[PDB]
mmCIF file of C-alpha atoms and ligand atoms in Angstrom:
data_model
loop_
_atom_site.group_PDB
_atom_site.id
_atom_site.type_symbol
_atom_site.label_atom_id
_atom_site.label_comp_id
_atom_site.label_asym_id
_atom_site.label_seq_id
_atom_site.Cartn_x
_atom_site.Cartn_y
_atom_site.Cartn_z
ATOM 1 C CA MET A 1 -13.135 13.582 -5.605
ATOM 2 C CA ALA A 2 -10.072 12.934 -3.494
ATOM 3 C CA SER A 3 -10.814 13.134 0.283
ATOM 4 C CA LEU A 4 -10.264 9.647 1.458
ATOM 5 C CA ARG A 5 -10.193 8.277 5.042
ATOM 6 C CA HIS A 6 -7.364 9.668 7.146
ATOM 7 C CA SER A 7 -7.437 7.657 10.445
ATOM 8 C CA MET A 8 -8.401 4.132 11.278
ATOM 9 C CA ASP A 9 -9.216 2.405 14.607
ATOM 10 C CA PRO A 10 -6.305 0.680 16.213
ATOM 11 C CA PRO A 11 -7.941 -2.761 15.878
ATOM 12 C CA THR A 12 -8.519 -2.162 12.209
ATOM 13 C CA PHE A 13 -4.814 -1.570 11.773
ATOM 14 C CA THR A 14 -3.595 -4.493 14.043
ATOM 15 C CA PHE A 15 -5.871 -7.031 12.404
ATOM 16 C CA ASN A 16 -5.205 -6.267 8.962
ATOM 17 C CA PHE A 17 -1.426 -5.446 9.211
ATOM 18 C CA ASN A 18 -0.365 -8.430 11.423
ATOM 19 C CA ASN A 19 2.330 -10.029 9.358
ATOM 20 C CA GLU A 20 1.670 -13.661 10.105
ATOM 21 C CA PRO A 21 1.331 -15.092 6.568
ATOM 22 C CA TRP A 22 -2.020 -16.912 6.962
ATOM 23 C CA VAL A 23 -5.278 -15.278 5.740
ATOM 24 C CA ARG A 24 -6.946 -15.965 9.149
ATOM 25 C CA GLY A 25 -10.080 -13.908 8.011
ATOM 26 C CA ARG A 26 -8.077 -11.017 6.526
ATOM 27 C CA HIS A 27 -10.244 -10.849 3.419
ATOM 28 C CA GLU A 28 -9.680 -7.162 2.644
ATOM 29 C CA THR A 29 -6.660 -5.273 1.571
ATOM 30 C CA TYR A 30 -5.835 -2.165 3.233
ATOM 31 C CA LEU A 31 -3.772 0.495 1.325
ATOM 32 C CA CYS A 32 -2.310 3.507 3.044
ATOM 33 C CA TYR A 33 -0.585 5.989 0.795
ATOM 34 C CA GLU A 34 1.432 9.323 1.170
ATOM 35 C CA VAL A 35 2.584 11.695 -1.614
ATOM 36 C CA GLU A 36 5.816 13.642 -1.838
ATOM 37 C CA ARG A 37 6.980 16.457 -4.302
ATOM 38 C CA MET A 38 10.261 16.910 -5.458
ATOM 39 C CA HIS A 39 11.993 20.369 -4.485
ATOM 40 C CA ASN A 40 15.633 21.155 -4.404
ATOM 41 C CA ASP A 41 16.853 17.467 -4.326
ATOM 42 C CA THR A 42 14.306 16.716 -1.541
ATOM 43 C CA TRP A 43 11.101 14.923 -1.135
ATOM 44 C CA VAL A 44 8.470 17.253 0.436
ATOM 45 C CA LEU A 45 5.537 15.668 2.177
ATOM 46 C CA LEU A 46 2.087 16.724 0.836
ATOM 47 C CA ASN A 47 0.194 15.911 3.955
ATOM 48 C CA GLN A 48 -3.362 16.944 2.744
ATOM 49 C CA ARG A 49 -3.065 14.112 0.021
ATOM 50 C CA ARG A 50 -2.527 11.226 2.428
ATOM 51 C CA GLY A 51 -5.202 8.555 3.092
ATOM 52 C CA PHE A 52 -6.026 4.976 3.199
ATOM 53 C CA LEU A 53 -8.616 2.805 1.611
ATOM 54 C CA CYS A 54 -9.655 -0.885 1.266
ATOM 55 C CA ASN A 55 -11.030 -3.060 -1.338
ATOM 56 C CA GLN A 56 -14.718 -2.762 -1.956
ATOM 57 C CA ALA A 57 -16.594 -6.210 -1.690
ATOM 58 C CA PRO A 58 -19.215 -7.210 -4.168
ATOM 59 C CA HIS A 59 -22.366 -5.007 -3.239
ATOM 60 C CA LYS A 60 -25.650 -4.435 -5.090
ATOM 61 C CA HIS A 61 -25.225 -0.735 -4.865
ATOM 62 C CA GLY A 62 -21.509 -0.847 -5.236
ATOM 63 C CA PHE A 63 -19.431 -2.890 -7.671
ATOM 64 C CA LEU A 64 -21.407 -6.136 -8.571
ATOM 65 C CA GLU A 65 -18.066 -7.977 -8.704
ATOM 66 C CA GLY A 66 -16.270 -5.948 -6.164
ATOM 67 C CA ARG A 67 -13.105 -3.560 -6.800
ATOM 68 C CA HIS A 68 -9.701 -4.507 -5.727
ATOM 69 C CA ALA A 69 -7.952 -1.898 -3.401
ATOM 70 C CA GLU A 70 -5.257 -1.330 -5.861
ATOM 71 C CA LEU A 71 -7.754 -0.374 -8.738
ATOM 72 C CA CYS A 72 -9.528 1.958 -6.106
ATOM 73 C CA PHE A 73 -5.998 3.503 -5.573
ATOM 74 C CA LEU A 74 -5.386 4.028 -9.326
ATOM 75 C CA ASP A 75 -8.970 5.639 -9.766
ATOM 76 C CA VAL A 76 -8.097 8.246 -7.125
ATOM 77 C CA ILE A 77 -4.797 9.467 -8.637
ATOM 78 C CA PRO A 78 -6.229 11.638 -11.522
ATOM 79 C CA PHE A 79 -8.495 13.384 -8.837
ATOM 80 C CA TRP A 80 -5.413 14.585 -7.166
ATOM 81 C CA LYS A 81 -4.951 16.941 -10.183
ATOM 82 C CA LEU A 82 -1.197 16.584 -9.670
ATOM 83 C CA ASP A 83 0.962 19.457 -11.512
ATOM 84 C CA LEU A 84 2.437 17.687 -14.442
ATOM 85 C CA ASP A 85 5.492 20.063 -14.329
ATOM 86 C CA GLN A 86 6.548 18.607 -11.039
ATOM 87 C CA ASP A 87 7.762 14.979 -9.839
ATOM 88 C CA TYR A 88 6.081 13.031 -7.293
ATOM 89 C CA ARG A 89 6.824 10.030 -5.156
ATOM 90 C CA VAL A 90 3.805 7.995 -4.087
ATOM 91 C CA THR A 91 4.416 5.462 -1.254
ATOM 92 C CA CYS A 92 1.804 2.938 -0.545
ATOM 93 C CA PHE A 93 1.743 0.542 2.475
ATOM 94 C CA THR A 94 -0.436 -2.491 1.807
ATOM 95 C CA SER A 95 -1.606 -5.315 4.013
ATOM 96 C CA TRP A 96 -1.477 -7.705 1.065
ATOM 97 C CA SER A 97 0.574 -7.500 -2.080
ATOM 98 C CA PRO A 98 -1.342 -7.081 -5.409
ATOM 99 C CA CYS A 99 -3.067 -9.853 -7.489
ATOM 100 C CA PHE A 100 -1.449 -10.191 -10.943
ATOM 101 C CA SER A 101 -4.108 -8.214 -12.806
ATOM 102 C CA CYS A 102 -3.660 -5.303 -10.319
ATOM 103 C CA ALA A 103 0.066 -5.465 -10.648
ATOM 104 C CA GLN A 104 -0.236 -5.296 -14.408
ATOM 105 C CA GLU A 105 -2.602 -2.359 -14.093
ATOM 106 C CA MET A 106 -0.136 -0.509 -11.621
ATOM 107 C CA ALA A 107 2.795 -1.227 -13.923
ATOM 108 C CA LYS A 108 0.926 0.036 -16.831
ATOM 109 C CA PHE A 109 0.014 3.215 -14.844
ATOM 110 C CA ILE A 110 3.654 3.899 -13.932
ATOM 111 C CA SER A 111 4.982 3.271 -17.405
ATOM 112 C CA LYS A 112 2.535 5.974 -18.825
ATOM 113 C CA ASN A 113 2.941 8.437 -15.867
ATOM 114 C CA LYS A 114 6.513 9.335 -15.650
ATOM 115 C CA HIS A 115 6.068 12.376 -13.298
ATOM 116 C CA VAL A 116 5.236 9.613 -10.596
ATOM 117 C CA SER A 117 7.576 7.327 -8.809
ATOM 118 C CA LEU A 118 5.966 4.581 -6.912
ATOM 119 C CA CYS A 119 7.121 2.842 -3.542
ATOM 120 C CA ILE A 120 5.385 -0.161 -2.326
ATOM 121 C CA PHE A 121 5.789 -1.652 1.134
ATOM 122 C CA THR A 122 3.697 -4.738 1.894
ATOM 123 C CA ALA A 123 3.009 -6.397 5.144
ATOM 124 C CA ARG A 124 2.330 -9.755 3.447
ATOM 125 C CA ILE A 125 2.761 -11.545 -0.017
ATOM 126 C CA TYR A 126 -0.445 -12.731 -1.253
ATOM 127 C CA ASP A 127 0.235 -16.002 -3.179
ATOM 128 C CA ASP A 128 -2.309 -15.119 -5.742
ATOM 129 C CA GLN A 129 -2.951 -18.661 -7.233
ATOM 130 C CA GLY A 130 0.883 -19.111 -7.621
ATOM 131 C CA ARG A 131 1.291 -15.874 -9.470
ATOM 132 C CA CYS A 132 2.870 -13.577 -6.883
ATOM 133 C CA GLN A 133 6.307 -13.856 -8.098
ATOM 134 C CA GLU A 134 5.159 -12.701 -11.524
ATOM 135 C CA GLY A 135 3.213 -9.791 -10.300
ATOM 136 C CA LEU A 136 6.043 -8.478 -8.042
ATOM 137 C CA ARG A 137 8.545 -8.719 -11.050
ATOM 138 C CA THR A 138 6.070 -7.107 -13.303
ATOM 139 C CA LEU A 139 5.780 -4.075 -10.935
ATOM 140 C CA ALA A 140 9.739 -4.002 -10.429
ATOM 141 C CA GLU A 141 10.362 -4.046 -14.233
ATOM 142 C CA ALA A 142 8.120 -0.933 -14.799
ATOM 143 C CA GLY A 143 10.105 1.045 -12.164
ATOM 144 C CA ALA A 144 8.287 0.554 -8.788
ATOM 145 C CA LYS A 145 10.506 -0.065 -5.650
ATOM 146 C CA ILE A 146 9.072 -2.865 -3.806
ATOM 147 C CA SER A 147 9.798 -3.551 -0.034
ATOM 148 C CA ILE A 148 8.550 -5.726 2.862
ATOM 149 C CA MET A 149 7.164 -3.797 5.775
ATOM 150 C CA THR A 150 9.541 -3.969 8.795
ATOM 151 C CA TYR A 151 9.122 -2.451 12.276
ATOM 152 C CA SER A 152 10.063 0.977 11.194
ATOM 153 C CA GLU A 153 7.286 0.920 8.450
ATOM 154 C CA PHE A 154 4.665 -0.467 10.808
ATOM 155 C CA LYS A 155 5.394 2.138 13.436
ATOM 156 C CA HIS A 156 5.283 4.891 10.668
ATOM 157 C CA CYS A 157 1.873 3.804 9.493
ATOM 158 C CA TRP A 158 0.639 3.371 13.127
ATOM 159 C CA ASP A 159 1.849 6.834 13.926
ATOM 160 C CA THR A 160 0.595 8.219 10.607
ATOM 161 C CA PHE A 161 -2.871 6.591 10.015
ATOM 162 C CA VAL A 162 -4.023 5.267 13.403
ATOM 163 C CA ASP A 163 -6.305 7.122 15.996
ATOM 164 C CA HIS A 164 -3.651 6.065 18.598
ATOM 165 C CA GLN A 165 -4.091 8.977 20.911
ATOM 166 C CA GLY A 166 -0.392 9.024 21.659
ATOM 167 C CA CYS A 167 -0.058 5.251 22.451
ATOM 168 C CA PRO A 168 3.073 3.642 20.837
ATOM 169 C CA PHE A 169 3.067 0.976 18.126
ATOM 170 C CA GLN A 170 3.277 -2.218 20.101
ATOM 171 C CA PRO A 171 4.508 -5.036 18.023
ATOM 172 C CA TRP A 172 2.568 -8.118 17.765
ATOM 173 C CA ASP A 173 4.193 -11.534 18.280
ATOM 174 C CA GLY A 174 6.784 -12.599 15.679
ATOM 175 C CA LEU A 175 6.672 -9.313 13.811
ATOM 176 C CA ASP A 176 10.499 -9.417 13.244
ATOM 177 C CA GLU A 177 10.696 -13.079 12.272
ATOM 178 C CA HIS A 178 7.789 -12.659 9.884
ATOM 179 C CA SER A 179 9.435 -9.632 8.315
ATOM 180 C CA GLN A 180 12.759 -11.054 7.952
ATOM 181 C CA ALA A 181 11.404 -14.355 6.370
ATOM 182 C CA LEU A 182 9.276 -12.266 3.825
ATOM 183 C CA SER A 183 12.192 -10.132 2.923
ATOM 184 C CA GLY A 184 14.433 -13.007 2.141
ATOM 185 C CA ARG A 185 11.611 -14.149 -0.150
ATOM 186 C CA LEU A 186 11.236 -10.867 -1.854
ATOM 187 C CA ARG A 187 14.941 -10.590 -2.402
ATOM 188 C CA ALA A 188 15.028 -13.921 -4.241
ATOM 189 C CA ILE A 189 11.859 -12.913 -6.269
ATOM 190 C CA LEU A 190 13.274 -9.661 -7.405
ATOM 191 C CA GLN A 191 16.599 -11.305 -8.659
HETATM 192 ZN ZN1 LIG B 201 -6.330 -7.254 -7.655
#
């Protein structure tokens, strides 16, 4: 089934998406997603399909060894029952970028599922035991568009996924400087 969570508490967002590069207790990955369908050269938002999730930590009555957020995300796609005659764009906003094995699985998914275009915006690059450059390039090579979250993307996710009650997205200290540094890093990685 495909009814994932729609809204998070403001502190859940702020803690997890703050783009200072340090782990600082951010052991989870949050992944927010939206789906659009192509119609007359325009991307049409399918608002009922949106949601967010996080990784499942190791639990006796869950996954004994945990399940990364990216794999949980891939697991939900078949339950959407997408119309294979249509074209879709799936945008995911991630608090950390994928580990290499997840990037590999995501790349395999998009290679095989050519009705789907994937766009990823990440708040931070997870170093991934020195493999992050390889994981990001593997995703890009399979056709994913990879970008760094900047102010506009953080604001968009706040507006869309947070129970903000009309309060504005209020940037944490250093947001622009962290986004600019990370964007410079990603530009180098992708070339
Ligand atoms: Zn992973």
